[PDB]
């Protein structure tokens, strides 16, 4: 298909995790940083 | 020319638009028929001798005829499931430079530079040699990715528009119309469609939303109506053609039965195998059920004036705020509320 999947990446380690003792964060853009949610086929695998 | 300068730079002129686009979807249907729904007559089979490229071609022809021997309605169908959409839900701007017939501007330099500027930043354009005694077909492209491009026609309106009109099933003309409102006389289709002495029929308070696309000879009515026939030479389909033209009417039947006759599988008014959604090709008989064409209405999709409002930070469903400061987010009111995943 000549495409590529983006995984869970972010420009700041602060926003990549949330303070809830569980899943990771989901806020996409804070002021000028960014967080790209996982769109790869490995969504429910590869434990964090 | 000045409006070209303003729109190219980033200025906002004192005018607002509504976009209209038609989208096609593959559906699976379900039909039920009673027992003696048809008297189906079988004729006598005959053959035609016919010479061909190397030999002969035998054509076997058998005539037949059918009668609906039901006093009422003896068969009913209803669309059931949604398959993949055929069309692309994109942003391809309608070009009015495919049309010939209006009065030209005096200086041909201005018209050529204006067409050249409009061709920049757009997909479909007339070809550069300008074929006289031709159809002004736009130049074909390479292969396509996600379906047939759907054109979007722009209708102007005044800026101070009641935005709550666009959160439900509205009419692009700004004034609801159609044959459906009757009961007293014959020539009340024209009074509903164009007469502004009396108020609107649907929004039962005012004459019309935009007074630039609703009167008998307004700008939108002079531009898109088929009776005036301004865009006849344009080969591309106009998605707001069905909203502005008065339908031909015979008043012998009552309203509800003729509504049922208009509700059947009408012939399509677009092209399927082609790439830019052109006009209806002659000889093409494909029957498509057409909702929201017999009610003269269009549905607003999920749209917002900022990308920030359209999506939330929850890893799930979309945003839900109505207006933030001066922007807006119109929630989806189409029949495809829970389909077409995002």
């Amino acid at each position: 298909f000549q495409e590529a999947y983006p995984p869970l990446c972010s420009s700041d380690a602060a926003m990549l995790r949330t303070a809830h003792a569980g899943e990771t964060g989901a806020d996409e853009v804070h002021l000028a940083q960014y967080l790209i949610r996982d769109a790869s086929p490995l969504r429910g695998c590869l434990p964090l | 020319i000045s409006l070209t300068h303003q729109l190219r730079t980033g200025f906002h002129p004192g005018i607002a638009f509504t976009v209209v686009r038609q989208d096609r979807f593959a559906t699976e249907q379900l039909l039920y028929a009673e027992r003696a729904s048809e008297s189906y007559f079988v004729g006598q089979i005959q053959v035609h001798h016919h010479d061909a490229i190397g030999g002969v071609n035998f054509t076997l022809t058998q005539p037949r005829a059918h009668v609906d021997l039901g006093v009422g309605y003896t068969a009913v169908c209803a669309t059931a499931a949604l398959r993949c959409p055929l069309t692309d839900m994109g942003n391809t701007a309608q070009n009015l430079f495919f049309s010939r017939g209006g009065v030209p501007m005096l200086h041909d330099n201005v018209t050529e530079s204006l067409r050249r500027i409009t061709a920049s930043g757009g997909r479909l354009n007339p070809t550069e040699p300008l074929p006289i005694f031709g159809g002004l077909r736009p130049a074909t492209s390479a292969g396509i990715a996600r379906g047939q491009a759907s054109v979007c026609e722009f209708v102007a309106m005044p800026v101070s528009t009641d935005l709550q009109y666009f959160r439900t099933a509205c009419n692009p003309r700004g004034r609801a119309s159609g044959m459906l409102y009757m009961g007293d006389r014959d020539a009340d289709i024209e009074a509903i469609m164009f007469d502004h002495t009396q108020s609107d029929v649907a929004y039962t308070d005012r004459a019309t939303l935009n007074p630039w696309a609703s009167q008998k000879h307004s700008y939108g009515d002079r531009l898109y109506n088929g009776t005036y026939n301004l865009t006849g030479a344009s080969p591309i389909y106009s998605p707001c053609f069905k909203f502005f033209t008065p339908a031909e009417v015979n008043t012998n039947c009552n309203t509800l039965d003729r509504l049922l006759m208009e509700a059947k599988a009408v012939a399509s008014q677009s092209s399927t195998d082609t790439e830019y959604q052109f006009k209806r090709p002659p000889g093409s008989t494909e029957m498509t059920q057409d909702p929201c064409g017999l009610f003269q209405e269009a549905y607003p999709p999920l749209c917002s004036s900022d990308a920030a409002m359209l999506r939330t930070a929850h890893a799930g469903e979309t945003g839900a705020d109505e207006v933030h400061l001066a922007q807006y987010l119109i929630r989806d009111a189409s029949p495809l509320r829970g389909c077409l995943p995002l």
Binding site: - | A26, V56, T118, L230, A333
Partner: protein, 402 residues
């Protein structure tokens, strides 16, 4: 491979029609069929006029169609079939057997194609006949009898708008609730009036119960309705096999020539269900017919939906420019870049990609010369009733040297 032959009578779509042979069809100008239907009354008193009974005379006419099928022959086949008792040698005989073998093998499928396409023509005419259920069922219910005024008719029309907006994809939306699907299948079935009852032999099941219709779907919808929604009544059905031939002769023949007028089982494996209180066929004919042939299947029809979006509207009232919270969308700039009037609209694509319609896309429409075609408009407004008005604001004078 060996092709299988489909017989039109053995199909479950055969119950929806009465096929009769008619040799002299090509000489028929018009067909006429007549109805004489009467209606009852009740008697009342008070300020109501007494009623007289009504009789209705309805007349319908035939619609003539056709079926065409082609069949080709190579030139060498003609050459080796044009012998007529001249040959019989041992070299061209094999070629002649190959030619007549291709002849018979081709003619067999050509003869099969009519039996295969009669079902296609019934699907075509039944699609061209049937109104939508979302428009048939409220009219059959919400008006009691008819002859409505403006008001109840307008309320009915609003109900129809809501019903079309709601109940359009009800199979793929409420697929997690099987109780509703069997709840509107009986609404589909108990909404069509029946037809005439005159017949000699009918379609029945194994027990002998008379069938009541046919319900044709796609194969996937047949599977979904068959797995857990509807209940199987039988696996085999009794199907009539003969056509029924009528011819004109004698007094009818001499009338037609002079005046110009004229007057008048098998067991098949097919699954039957019961819906509501009626017994119907349920056929999803996709493997017997329309398989590995270049024709598209009906019941795969398309719909067109029109989408409308405002583009650059600015909310004029200062009441309506409110924020739900204080710090909703803050920016480092000293001036918040959201008070400004919007210039674009963001929607979603077919695949879910975010796209944008900027006002720069409007130059294909508003920057045309058609914005200055005021001449026909001026001609139209100059032909109506105008009153004598003061001309203070539209008149320009000249200086008079003072």
């Amino acid at each position: 491979n060996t092709l299988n032959f489909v017989r039109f009578l053995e199909l479950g779509l055969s119950v929806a029609c009465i096929c009769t042979k008619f040799p002299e069809l090509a000489y028929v100008r018009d067909g006429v069929i007549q109805f004489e239907v009467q209606q009852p009354m009740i008697a009342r008193d008070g300020p109501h006029p007494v009623d007289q009974p009504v009789h209705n005379y309805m007349v319908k006419r035939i619609h003539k169609r056709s079926l065409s099928a082609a069949f080709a022959i190579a030139s060498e086949a003609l050459s080796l079939l044009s012998n007529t008792y001249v040959d019989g040698t041992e070299i061209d005989s094999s070629l002649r057997i190959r030619a007549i073998q291709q002849m018979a093998r081709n003619l067999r499928t050509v003869l099969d194609s009519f039996e295969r396409g009669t079902a296609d023509q019934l699907l075509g005419v039944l699609l061209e006949k049937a109104p939508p259920l979302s428009l048939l069922s409220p009219i059959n219910k919400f008006q009691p009898e008819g002859h409505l005024n403006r008001v109840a008719r307008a309320a009915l029309l609003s109900d129809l708008k809501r019903r079309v907006c709601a109940d359009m994809f009800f199979m793929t939306r409420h697929a997690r609730e099987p109780r509703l699907i069997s709840a509107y299948l009986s609404d589909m079935v108990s909404c069509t009036q029946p037809s005439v009852m005159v017949s000699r032999i009918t379609h029945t099941n194994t027990r002998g119960r008379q069938v009541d219709g046919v319900l044709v779907t796609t194969a996937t919808l047949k599977r979904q309705l068959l797995q857990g929604i509807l209940q199987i009544d039988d696996t085999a059905a009794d199907v009539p096999v003969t056509y029924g031939e009528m011819v004109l002769q004698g007094t009818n023949l001499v009338t037609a020539l002079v005046m110009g007028k004229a007057v008048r089982n098998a067991r098949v494996p097919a699954d039957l269900v019961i819906v509501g209180d009626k017994l119907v066929f349920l056929e999803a004919l996709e493997r017997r017919v329309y398989q590995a042939t270049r024709v598209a299947y009906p019941l795969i029809g398309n719909i067109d939906i029109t989408f409308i979006m405002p583009m650059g509207v600015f909310q004029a009232n200062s009441m309506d420019r409110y924020t739900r919270h204080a710090g909703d969308f803050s920016t480092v700039s000293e001036q918040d870049p959201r008070q400004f009037p919007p210039q674009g609209i963001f929607f979603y694509n077919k695949d879910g990609i975010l796209t944008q319609l900027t006002l720069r896309d409007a130059m294909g429409t508003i920057c045309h010369s058609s914005l200055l075609d005021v001449e026909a408009t001026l001609v139209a407004l100059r032909q109506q009733h105008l009153d004598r008005q003061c001309y203070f604001g539209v008149y320009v004078a000249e200086g008079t040297e003072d």
